[PDB]
mmCIF file of C-alpha atoms in Angstrom:
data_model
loop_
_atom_site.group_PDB
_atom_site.id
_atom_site.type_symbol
_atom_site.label_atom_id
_atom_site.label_comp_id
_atom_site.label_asym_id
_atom_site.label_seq_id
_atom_site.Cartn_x
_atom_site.Cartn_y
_atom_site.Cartn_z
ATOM 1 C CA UNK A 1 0.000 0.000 0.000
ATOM 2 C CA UNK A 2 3.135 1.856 0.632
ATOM 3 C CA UNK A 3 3.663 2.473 -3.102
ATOM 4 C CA UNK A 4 0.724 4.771 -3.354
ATOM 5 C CA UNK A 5 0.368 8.483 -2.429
ATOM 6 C CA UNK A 6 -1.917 8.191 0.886
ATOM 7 C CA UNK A 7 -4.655 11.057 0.511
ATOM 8 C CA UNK A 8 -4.892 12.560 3.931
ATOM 9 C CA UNK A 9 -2.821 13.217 7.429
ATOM 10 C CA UNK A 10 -3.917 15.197 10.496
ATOM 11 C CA UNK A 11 -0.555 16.168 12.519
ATOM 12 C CA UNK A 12 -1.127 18.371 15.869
ATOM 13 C CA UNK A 13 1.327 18.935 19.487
ATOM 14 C CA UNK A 14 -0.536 17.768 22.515
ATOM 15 C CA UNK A 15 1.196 17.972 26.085
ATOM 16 C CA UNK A 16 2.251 15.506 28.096
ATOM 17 C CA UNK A 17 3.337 16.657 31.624
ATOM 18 C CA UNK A 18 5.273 13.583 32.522
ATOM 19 C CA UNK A 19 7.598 13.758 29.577
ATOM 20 C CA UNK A 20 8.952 16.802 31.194
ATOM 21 C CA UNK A 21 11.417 19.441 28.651
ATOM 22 C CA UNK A 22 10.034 16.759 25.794
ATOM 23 C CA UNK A 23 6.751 17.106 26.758
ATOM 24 C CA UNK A 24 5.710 18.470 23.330
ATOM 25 C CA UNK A 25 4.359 15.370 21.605
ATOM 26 C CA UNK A 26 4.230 15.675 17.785
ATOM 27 C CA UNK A 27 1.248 13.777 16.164
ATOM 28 C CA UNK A 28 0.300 12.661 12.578
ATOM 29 C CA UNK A 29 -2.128 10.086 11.828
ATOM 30 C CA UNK A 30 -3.321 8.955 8.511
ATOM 31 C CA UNK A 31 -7.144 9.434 8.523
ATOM 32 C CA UNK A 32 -7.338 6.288 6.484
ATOM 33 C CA UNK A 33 -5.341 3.541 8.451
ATOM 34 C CA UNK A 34 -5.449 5.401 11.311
ATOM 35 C CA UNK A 35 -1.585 4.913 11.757
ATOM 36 C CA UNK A 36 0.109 7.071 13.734
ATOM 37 C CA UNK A 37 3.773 8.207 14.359
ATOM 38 C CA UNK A 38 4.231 10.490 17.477
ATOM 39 C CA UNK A 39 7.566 11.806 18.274
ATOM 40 C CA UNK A 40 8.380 13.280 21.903
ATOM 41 C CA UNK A 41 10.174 16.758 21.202
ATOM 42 C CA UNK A 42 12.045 20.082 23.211
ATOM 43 C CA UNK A 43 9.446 22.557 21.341
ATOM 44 C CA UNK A 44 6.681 23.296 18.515
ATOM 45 C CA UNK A 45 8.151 25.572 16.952
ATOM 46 C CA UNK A 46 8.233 25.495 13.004
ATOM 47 C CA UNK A 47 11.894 24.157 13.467
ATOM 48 C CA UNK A 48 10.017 21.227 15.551
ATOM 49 C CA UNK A 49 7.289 20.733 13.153
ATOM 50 C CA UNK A 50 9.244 20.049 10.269
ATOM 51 C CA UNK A 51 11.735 17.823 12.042
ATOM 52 C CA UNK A 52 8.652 15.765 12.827
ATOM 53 C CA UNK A 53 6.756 15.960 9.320
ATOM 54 C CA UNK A 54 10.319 14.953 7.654
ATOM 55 C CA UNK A 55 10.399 11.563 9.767
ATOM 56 C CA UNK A 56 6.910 11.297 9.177
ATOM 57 C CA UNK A 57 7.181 11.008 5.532
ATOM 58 C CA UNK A 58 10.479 8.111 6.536
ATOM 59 C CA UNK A 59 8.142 6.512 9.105
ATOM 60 C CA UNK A 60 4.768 6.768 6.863
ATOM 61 C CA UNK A 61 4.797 7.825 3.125
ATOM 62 C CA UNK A 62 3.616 10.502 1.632
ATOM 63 C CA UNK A 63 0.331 12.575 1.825
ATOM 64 C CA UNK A 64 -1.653 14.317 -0.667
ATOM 65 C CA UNK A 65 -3.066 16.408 1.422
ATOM 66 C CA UNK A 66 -2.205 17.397 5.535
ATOM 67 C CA UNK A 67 -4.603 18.925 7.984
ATOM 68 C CA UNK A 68 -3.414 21.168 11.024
ATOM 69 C CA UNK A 69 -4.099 23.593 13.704
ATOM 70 C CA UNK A 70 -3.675 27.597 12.339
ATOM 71 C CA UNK A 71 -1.056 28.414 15.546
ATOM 72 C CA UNK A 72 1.744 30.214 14.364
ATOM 73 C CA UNK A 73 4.403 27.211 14.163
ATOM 74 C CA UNK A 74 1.630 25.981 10.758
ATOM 75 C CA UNK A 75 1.669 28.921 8.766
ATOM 76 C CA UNK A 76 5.108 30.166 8.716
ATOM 77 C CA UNK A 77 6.811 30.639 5.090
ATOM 78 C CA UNK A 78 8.968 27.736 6.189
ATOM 79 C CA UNK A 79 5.693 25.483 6.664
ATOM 80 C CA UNK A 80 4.749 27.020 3.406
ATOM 81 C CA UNK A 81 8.129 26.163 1.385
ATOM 82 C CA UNK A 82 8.459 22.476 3.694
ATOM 83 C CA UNK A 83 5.275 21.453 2.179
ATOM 84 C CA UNK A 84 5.919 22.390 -1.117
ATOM 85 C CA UNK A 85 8.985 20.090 -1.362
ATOM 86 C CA UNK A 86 6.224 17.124 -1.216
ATOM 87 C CA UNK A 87 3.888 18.960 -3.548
ATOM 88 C CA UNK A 88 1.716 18.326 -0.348
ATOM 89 C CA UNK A 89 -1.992 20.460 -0.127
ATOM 90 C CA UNK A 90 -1.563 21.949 3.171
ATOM 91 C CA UNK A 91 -5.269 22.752 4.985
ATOM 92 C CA UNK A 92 -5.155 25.118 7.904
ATOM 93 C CA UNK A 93 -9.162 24.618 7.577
ATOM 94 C CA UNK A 94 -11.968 26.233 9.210
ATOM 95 C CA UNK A 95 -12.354 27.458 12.517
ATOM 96 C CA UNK A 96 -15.760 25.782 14.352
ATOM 97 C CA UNK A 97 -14.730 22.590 12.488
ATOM 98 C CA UNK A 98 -14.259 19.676 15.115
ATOM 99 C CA UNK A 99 -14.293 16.996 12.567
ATOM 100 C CA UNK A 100 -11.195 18.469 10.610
ATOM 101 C CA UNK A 101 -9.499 17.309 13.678
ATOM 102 C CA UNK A 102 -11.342 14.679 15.540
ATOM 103 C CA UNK A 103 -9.162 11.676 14.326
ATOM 104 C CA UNK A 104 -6.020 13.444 15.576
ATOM 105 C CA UNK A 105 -7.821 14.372 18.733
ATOM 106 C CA UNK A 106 -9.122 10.540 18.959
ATOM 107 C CA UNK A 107 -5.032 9.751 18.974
ATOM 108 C CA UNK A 108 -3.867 12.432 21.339
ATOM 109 C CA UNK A 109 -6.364 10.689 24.050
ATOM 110 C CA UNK A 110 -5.440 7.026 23.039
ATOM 111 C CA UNK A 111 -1.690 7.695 23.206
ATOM 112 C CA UNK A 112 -2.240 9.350 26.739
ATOM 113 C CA UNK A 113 -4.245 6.951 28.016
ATOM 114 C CA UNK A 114 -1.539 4.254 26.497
ATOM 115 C CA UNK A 115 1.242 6.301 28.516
ATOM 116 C CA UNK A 116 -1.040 6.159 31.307
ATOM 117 C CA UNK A 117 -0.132 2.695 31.790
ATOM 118 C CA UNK A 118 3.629 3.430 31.869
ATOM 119 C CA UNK A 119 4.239 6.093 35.147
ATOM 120 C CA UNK A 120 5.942 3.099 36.347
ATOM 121 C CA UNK A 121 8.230 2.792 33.247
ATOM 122 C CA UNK A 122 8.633 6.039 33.490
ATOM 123 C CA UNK A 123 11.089 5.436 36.148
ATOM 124 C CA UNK A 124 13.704 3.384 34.139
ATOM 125 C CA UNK A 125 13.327 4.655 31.114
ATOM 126 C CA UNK A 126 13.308 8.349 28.597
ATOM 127 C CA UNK A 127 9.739 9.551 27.097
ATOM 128 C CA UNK A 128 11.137 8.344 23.487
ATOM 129 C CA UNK A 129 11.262 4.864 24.412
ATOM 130 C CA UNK A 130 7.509 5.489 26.371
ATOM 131 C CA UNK A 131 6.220 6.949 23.689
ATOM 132 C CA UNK A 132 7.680 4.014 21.262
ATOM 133 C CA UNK A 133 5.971 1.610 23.301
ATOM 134 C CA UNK A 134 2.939 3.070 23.418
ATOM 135 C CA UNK A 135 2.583 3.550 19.399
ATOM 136 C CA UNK A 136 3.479 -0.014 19.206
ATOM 137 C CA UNK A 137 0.707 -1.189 21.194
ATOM 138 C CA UNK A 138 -1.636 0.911 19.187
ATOM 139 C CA UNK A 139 -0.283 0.533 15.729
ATOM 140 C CA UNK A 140 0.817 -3.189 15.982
ATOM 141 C CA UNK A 141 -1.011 -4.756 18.953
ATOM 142 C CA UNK A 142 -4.749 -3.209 18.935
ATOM 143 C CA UNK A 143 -6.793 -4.710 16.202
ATOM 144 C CA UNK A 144 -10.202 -3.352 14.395
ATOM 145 C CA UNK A 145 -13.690 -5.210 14.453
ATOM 146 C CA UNK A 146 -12.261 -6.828 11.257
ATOM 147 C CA UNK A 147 -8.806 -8.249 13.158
ATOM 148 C CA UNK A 148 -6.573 -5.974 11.623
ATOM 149 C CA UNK A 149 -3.812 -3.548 12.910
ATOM 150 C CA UNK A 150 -3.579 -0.097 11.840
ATOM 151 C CA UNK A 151 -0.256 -1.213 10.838
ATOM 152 C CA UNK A 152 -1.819 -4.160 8.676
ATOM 153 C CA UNK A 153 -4.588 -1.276 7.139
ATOM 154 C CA UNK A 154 -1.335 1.002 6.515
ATOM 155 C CA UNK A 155 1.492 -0.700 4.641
ATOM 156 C CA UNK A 156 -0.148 -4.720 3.999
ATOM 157 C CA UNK A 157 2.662 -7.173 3.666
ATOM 158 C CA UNK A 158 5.716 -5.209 3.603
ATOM 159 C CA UNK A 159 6.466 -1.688 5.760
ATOM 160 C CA UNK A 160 8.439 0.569 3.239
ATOM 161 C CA UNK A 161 9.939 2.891 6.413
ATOM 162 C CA UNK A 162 12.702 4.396 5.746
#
C-alpha cells in the first residue's frame, strides 16, 4: 500500500506533563489507516514541526493532502516552502470545524491513556522509548472489528519505512 500516495494526514502537538522538557508530543495520523507516528520533542516551533513531518514522511509515506491547527508554528513561510517540497496540499481549515481534527484528537487521548499505563516505566526509562511503546501497542497490537492492525490497514505485507 506503501507504493501509493496516501490522501490525507492530520498532525497536531498535545502535552504531556510527565515527559517533562520533551513534553511536546508531535502527532500525525493517517485518517485512512489510522496509523500514527508520534515523536516526543524540546518545542513546537516550526523548526520542531518540520523535524517531525520529515520523519513522518520516513516513518509513513507521503500525503496528498495534511490537515493542522492555524497556531503560528503551521503557517510560517517555512511550513509554506516544507510542504511544497512534497507537492503536499496543506489545509489550515476552518475554525468551528471539530471533525477536521477529531481523528487526531481521537489519537492524542489514546496515546495518553496508552502512557497512562507506563508512570511506572517512566522510572527506568526516557519519554522516546515510552512513547515508542505506546505507538506499538496501538499501531501493531490493537486490532479493528475486522482483526486488523492499523499497521496491517497502513502498509499490507511489507512496511516501506525508511
Amino acid at each position: 500500500r506503501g507504493l501509493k500516495p496516501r490522501v490525507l494526514w492530520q498532525m497536531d502537538v498535545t502535552h504531556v506533563s510527565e515527559f517533562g522538557k520533551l513534553k511536546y508530543v508531535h502527532v500525525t495520523v493517517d485518517t485512512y489507516s489510522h496509523f500514527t507516528f508520534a515523536t516526543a520533542r524540546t518545542g513546537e516551533a516550526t523548526k520542531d514541526v518540520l523535524q517531525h513531518l520529515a520523519q513522518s514522511f520516513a516513518y509513513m509515506g507521503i500525503p496528498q493532502k495534511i490537515k493542522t491547527d492555524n497556531a503560528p508554528a503551521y503557517v510560517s513561510r517555512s511550513i509554506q516552502e516544507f510542504l511544497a517540497r512534497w507537492k503536499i496540499s496543506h489545509v489550515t481549515g476552518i475554525p468551528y470545524n471539530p471533525q477536521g481534527q477529531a481523528i487526531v484528537e481521537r489519537t492524542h487521548q489514546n496515546i495518553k491513556a496508552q502512557l497512562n499505563k507506563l508512570q511506572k516505566a517512566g522510572k527506568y526509562y526516557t519519554p522516546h522509548h515510552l512513547l515508542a511503546h505506546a505507538l506499538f501497542v496501538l499501531n501493531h497490537v490493537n486490532m479493528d472489528n475486522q482483526g486488523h492492525t492499523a499497521a496491517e490497514r497502513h502498509w499490507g505485507p511489507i512496511s516501506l519505512e525508511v
